[PDB]
A = this chain, B = another copy of it.
Amino acid sequence: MVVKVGINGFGRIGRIVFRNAVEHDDVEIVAVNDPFIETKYAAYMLKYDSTHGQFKGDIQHSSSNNLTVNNKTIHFYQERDPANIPWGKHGVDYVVESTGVFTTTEKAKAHLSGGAKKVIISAPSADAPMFVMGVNEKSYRPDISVLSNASCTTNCLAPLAKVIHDNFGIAEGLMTTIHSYTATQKTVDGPSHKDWRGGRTAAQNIIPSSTGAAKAVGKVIPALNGKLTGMAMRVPTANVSVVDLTCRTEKPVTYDQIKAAVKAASEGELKGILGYSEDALVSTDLNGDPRSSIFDASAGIALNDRFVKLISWYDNEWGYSRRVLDLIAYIAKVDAGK
């Protein structure tokens, strides 16, 4: 029950994974690596958060490169190469790979040479198996050393798509995610040679963007392979995003049957993963929501019994970070006594 975890990349996801982990007893963070964030600086970035407010616990700078958070010691490193991080020195079993620059199996596996046993990439991967809690975590096997928790958008769309497909079938679906800007964007028009639109002033523009999240649902849900795709629109909010899923079902279904199916799943097998609301929600109301997907019943609309537009919110930082921790706890039980 003592799951020792390390974090590589103390950014938005790394710090919010950290914040949720230290406020609970299911997982212990023992080590953090980030070459661009010194230990005293890390304490400040943890204490003060523009999006999620001040850290509630207690923080102390104990030694040169240690922090004491809630009477627990955490060692910090500044290694640019993951192979140089001594995870095994402190008994790190599971590493959260949240840098954004080690998303392939060949790069992420460098944590294993440092003593780590499992690596969980906090992003989609070109070749590592992807998992979405509540959709396909039971397909995990203990022989898998490098895994992916997919993207925030996939974690929003896949639980919803599972409910719709299981109950009424998805013949075809097209998705738009209206998505808050992120750390990859620019404050003013700047270089983004791999994504020209993505370099434009983040808080002044609606910015079309590509995403693999809808195609990735066809990997976590194989029966939907080739039946979903979509795109993204980056808009001037700093956090919280929303999925807009236009799909044609296989069976006739009313919008009230869709609502009831989602509400049923939200209270049953997908409790804590898929939420259901009928309130007049706006994006700030979902800031800090721990679910992966919050279905907005009153925002969607149906054209007919076969063609519907479904709206589901997600805090792209908070919900996804909790899934990382949920995934770590799940595979920790499988690797031991399941």
Contacts and interface: CB of A to CB of B under 8 A. Distances in A.
B299 A208 contact: yes
A49 B307 CA distance: 34
Interface string A230-269: 1101011111101010101000000000000000000000
Contact of A188 (B183, B240, B296): B183
A41 B186 CA distance: 16
A84 interface: no
Contacts of A207: 282-283
A139 interface: no
Contacts of A127: none
A197 interface: yes
Contact of A45 (B173, B174, B189, B239): B189
Contacts of A65: none
A281 interface: yes
Given A36-B191, A37-B193, A285-B54, A172 B304 contact: yes
Interface in A187-227: 187-191, 193, 196-197, 199-208, 227
A38 interface: yes
A113 interface: no
A309 to B, nearest CB: 5
A12 interface: yes
Q: Which of A282, A299, A303, A311 is packed against the most chain B CB atoms within 10 Å?
A: A282
A236 to B, nearest CB: 4
This chain: copies in complex:
4
A188 B51 contact: yes
Given A53-B288, A242-B206, A242-B233, A187 B181 contact: yes
A330 B41 CA distance: 42
A284 B173 CA distance: 30
A204 B181 CA distance: 12
A47 B278 CA distance: 14
Interface string A136-149: 00000000000000
A242 B231 CA distance: 14
Nearest to A195: B280
Nearest to A285: B48
Contact of A48 (B45, B227, B279): B279
A311 B208 contact: yes
Contacts of A235: 178, 206, 235-237
A197 B281 contact: yes
Contact of A303 (B50, B172, B191, B197): B172
A244 B311 CA distance: 14
Nearest to A190: B183
Interface in A45-69: 45, 47-51, 53-54
25 contacts: A37-B191, A38-B193, A44-B280, A48-B279, A50-B282, A50-B285, A51-B284, A174-B246, A174-B303, A174-B307, A176-B176, A178-B178, A178-B235, A183-B188, A200-B282, A205-B282, A227-B303, A229-B303, A230-B301, A231-B301, A233-B242, A235-B235, A235-B236, A236-B237, A246-B309
* A-B pairs, 9 with minimum CB distance: A203-B203, A208-B299, A206-B283, A246-B246, A196-B280, A50-B201, A205-B282, A235-B235, A36-B191
